[PDB]
């Protein structure tokens, strides 16, 4: 599903809607959404 990263473990997790937001590796309750896969364009100016 959608990917998140533990704010402390820096590990990758996949979360569904019904999943409680925790890191299975350590138990941290703060997660950051993963970087988008669609390309990003920047003007070098």
């Amino acid at each position: 599903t959608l990917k998140y990263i533990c704010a402390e473990c820096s590990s990758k997790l996949s979360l569904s809607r019904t999943d409680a937001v925790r890191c299975k590796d350590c138990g941290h309750r703060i997660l950051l959404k993963a970087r988008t896969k669609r390309l990003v364009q920047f003007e070098a100016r």
């Binding site: 990263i5 704010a7 820096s10 950051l32 970087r35």
Partner: protein, 69 residues
């Protein structure tokens, strides 16, 4: 944050003269003025570009990465 690529006023490339500047300051125990003159920064625009830079990126690198691979 990190050394600017070019001098703001004249546009001389100074982003490749930061590590050389630090090496001259540390290894050779040269004062700042002589080290700046050695690298070829003769106009005081470039001299203030390199002399007054604060390398904050080291501090940023101290924290653990948010996304670690």
């Amino acid at each position: 944050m990190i050394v600017p690529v070019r001098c703001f006023s004249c546009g001389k490339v100074v982003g490749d003269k930061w590590e050389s500047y630090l090496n001259l300051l540390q290894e050779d125990e040269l004062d700042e003025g002589t080290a700046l003159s050695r690298l070829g920064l003769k106009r005081y625009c470039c001299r203030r570009m390199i002399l007054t830079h604060v390398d904050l990126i080291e501090k940023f690198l101290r924290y653990n990465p948010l996304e670690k691979r």
